[model samples]
Target chain A: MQHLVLIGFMGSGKSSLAQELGLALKLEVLDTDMIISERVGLSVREIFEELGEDNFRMFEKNLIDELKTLKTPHVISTGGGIVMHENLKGLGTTFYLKMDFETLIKRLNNLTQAKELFEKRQALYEKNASFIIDARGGLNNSLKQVLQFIA
Target chain B: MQHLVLIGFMGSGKSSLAQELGLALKLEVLDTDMIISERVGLSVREIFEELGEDNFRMFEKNLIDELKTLKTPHVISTGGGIVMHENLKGLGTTFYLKMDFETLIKRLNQLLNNLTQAKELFEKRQALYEKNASFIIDARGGLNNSLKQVLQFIA
Candidate 1:
């Protein structure tokens, strides 16, 4: 079983890319952030509001560990900040969806919840991505490029 | 998501019943026997011949544990002998498709390979099923009755 882990900042279209990849490959798709959020019974914003970033990071670590053992040939989309952990490099074929800071700032300006996390994780995303796809063009182009590398 | 576990002796029509139940309830159908056979690149008969029963049982346990965690609802048709473990009762809602021993013996007599194992497993199926909350009926009758129960519960 193979796993395709998609990493990027908010608005870089990781969710959209994962969906496209799953359809193209006929594989299951899991959003790691969604998995963590559902397990906690709270949104990412709520997790940050109630337990703060330190506790949230601990939860993230636990979630990552669990995900490592998943039966695979599945696509997993991770939170922007998940790239900060160095251990994620060995998990699978990790793709970094890269968007220009100016483009990201514009997109974030429109989203109230994702802006905070985006601001915190930008640099870490660039450092960890195995292959970078410019996400500014659109989901179709970005997903095409990402899928090509993984295939 | 609810799990529907189907238990019965070989040739008792578990796969056909599972498909009908899946359609009636609009849920996915997962056949553990098929999944394992596919994963191992062999038929169930071939698996028994290649790795022996103990190794196959180990594969069965791993498959059951994995199925327990799926978020989606599904109708799962397990192998005839899977109900032997008393501990499996807690896994899900189980139904036993029971047929007379004479009927089972007649069916097994027609098969070519692994006749001894088939006969042995068939004899054990009834006692194994008795330990669980199971329905005992002929194959045709069981399908209609079990599908009704499943649809009613799910609805």
Candidate 2:
């Protein structure tokens, strides 16, 4: 169950890039956000509302536990909060779609709280990634680098 | 205080429709499945694997328990098994998205056992859904049209 787990901050393009890369490599793709959404039958915001952030994180933790039982390799596009620890380090290889604070803010279209998020989570993202793809480039370039890393 | 609760067979497009309705009306979208999945942090399939069929119902039962505690009008979607009781019957305005046996099977991707199971369920639960639902939508119709009908009906 060697997964190519993608991890990063919000607006890092983990899900879209995972789809392109997974299809290009002919591997199955899954997204934590979508899995949570599809299975729960609610949007991410909805989940947070009904169940507090603690409950939502509990759900994400359960997803990581579930991923450990996988019989096949999948390209999993993980939720932004998925990499809080070594939960993923043992399950599969992780890649960080590293983006600059400026790029992230640009994608966010507003910087309001993004600075705090970057300051808090930046080290964790860098620490957990076995490999890093400078995601500032086009999706095609990011895909090529990730595929090369996995190869 | 109220909910536009959507109910139907599994894979009957309840969740998707709820989101569309929620967005159009600016209401929050909630699903019993999401509530359960969040608490257990497992997929519905994984939950069945680790806990058993009985435990899963307990989850649905628990969700009903929790839903009563909310004090807002939400576009709530429910599990295939959630409405086994009248817990949600009068809790909100209910809509049942009706689909044929063939369509359900197709969405489930070629079900032999699933078909047999669905047939049994389609009979038993269809009656319950129709009994409890305020109205029904042809889930077979185009999505845009269905959305229009639901919005119009609810409005």
Candidate 3:
């Protein structure tokens, strides 16, 4: 059994979808961000605010490298910036939960800097994606689409 | 640029896609079956029928080994059973153009021991192809979309 990996922007519902998939598949779920937080004893926000993004990215890369040792098939929800590292692309069957700009804006409702970041990373996400899921349709619809492919 | 390698069952558009990519990029295209046929002075079907599959597999493995020495990057389209040879997995940016069983059966409507053999072979190779692939493209949508996806990825 191959691991199912979900990746996308902040509000693309990767974690939510991973949990749903794990429940549906009766497998363990691993969130890369949550794992990072557990390891550093700091929230992802704190890691970014204190240690800075460069350090956070380093940890993310290290975590992805560590996942190769994962023997069991697990549903993985990765950080928004996971595409920045190429190693994650081959780690699993990576699904990119793509959303339109308007939908993303509505979901976040919150950052100019974040908006710029989103614009910048769009191509990188697609470049690294194994399959692109239209997450603009919301959680259940997106899950259905993902499951359709998985099946 | 890295070499682009295409792998899939027969009629799944590996040769066509490789030609498309090669033409688009102004690169040379190398089809493994064609190479073997040329070497043996026979068609692929003829080789399979006359030489036996075991002998053909030996030639296939030899071709893959020779490919390791290729200095210039070329677009490569491999035979259907390329999955049986593990070394080909890391030879290039391998794309498994996956199609549904029905679609594949429809495409290969004409195969002595064709349908039953295809069914069993297809079932056995699904996991191998997925596991060995650098990427898997949903080729059920057809070659145009698959070409676009490959272009987008390589772009």
Candidate 4:
């Protein structure tokens, strides 16, 4: 089975890069955060508002457990802080898309949602990355590097 | 976390029915036979031809062991003769898609590709699945009733 998981700090382009990698490889694209949101019928922001951070973490862990048996050859994009759990290390080949802190702050400043949680999760993101891809060069260059690495 | 496994004799419509049921219930579909074939890079007939029956059974059991950690709300379809081992009873719900011997024989006869192996495997298939299916049903009446029963049982 071939498994590819993309991880990154907020505003580091994990989602856009995941989509590019998935398209290049003809693999299914799955976002653990999106799956969790759909399963609980709540937006990520609403989940934070209603259940608070701790409860949302519990739900995230449960969602990871539930997704463990997914068929391989899929690109999975995870929450920035999902690497905090040691068990997640074995789930797949981990690739962390990194960006300069200043660059991240600049992009995040323009975002309309989830800025607080993203800011809170930066340290956890740094701790779990297996391989890092600098995301400061924008989508085209970053995605080309990711595709070459996997290929 | 409920896992429902569908097993039966050959030509019992397990795969077709399992796919339909999986869609209706929003469960993931895991066909154990297909998984085994993919792992070995051979079709069931090829496996039987190369490894013979005893060795193939070992491969089948090993595949089942690998799949033990599969996430649930999954509809698993096992091979026609998978129920021989009583140990599978401990795994989860096993639904037998039971069809009469004549019907099974007739259906097997229609398969132009693997008729010889189907003939050779028929007896073992009956022996294995005889007591395995928690609920047995005739395949003649179409899969609607059987699908409903499975949904109700699992629900």
Q: Individual DockQ of the candidates? A: 0.01, 0.02, 0.01, 0.01
Top candidate, metric lDDT: 3
DockQ winner, 2 or 3: 2
List the pairs of residues colliding in candidate 4.
none
Q: Model 2 over residues A51-139: C-alpha lDDT tens digits?
A: 23444566678888898799799999976666664577876888998888677645622555424434657677778888999998879
Candidate 2 vs 3: which has more lDDT: 3
Model 4 ranges with Cα > 4 A deviation: A1-151, B111-127
lDDT of 2 by residue, B1-155 (tens): 46888988777788789889888988888878878888666566544323334556766876777777778889888876566665778668889888886776566543113234225535655777788888898899867777888888866
- When only the first chain is scored, the TM-scores of the models are 0.83, 0.88, 0.87, 0.81
| Candidate fnat values, all | 0.00, 0.00, 0.00, 0.00
Give the alpha carbon lDDT tens digit for every residue of B18-72 in model 1: 9998887778999887899887655655444223344567778878878878868
TM-score per candidate, in order?
A: 0.44, 0.48, 0.47, 0.45
lDDT of 1 by residue, A10-65 (tens): 66678988999899889999987787666655455444422334445667777777
lDDT of each: 0.67, 0.73, 0.74, 0.66
Off by over 4 Å in 3: A1-151, B110-121
Two-way DockQ contest, 1 vs 2, winner: 2
**For model 3, how does the per-residue alpha-carbon lDDT over A1-111 read when each residue is reduced to its tens digit?**
778989777666888899988998899999898888777655565444223345567788888878867878899998766776768877888898898866654552354
C-alpha lDDT of residue B107 in model 1: 49
Tell me the deviation in Å of residue A95 in model 2: 0.6
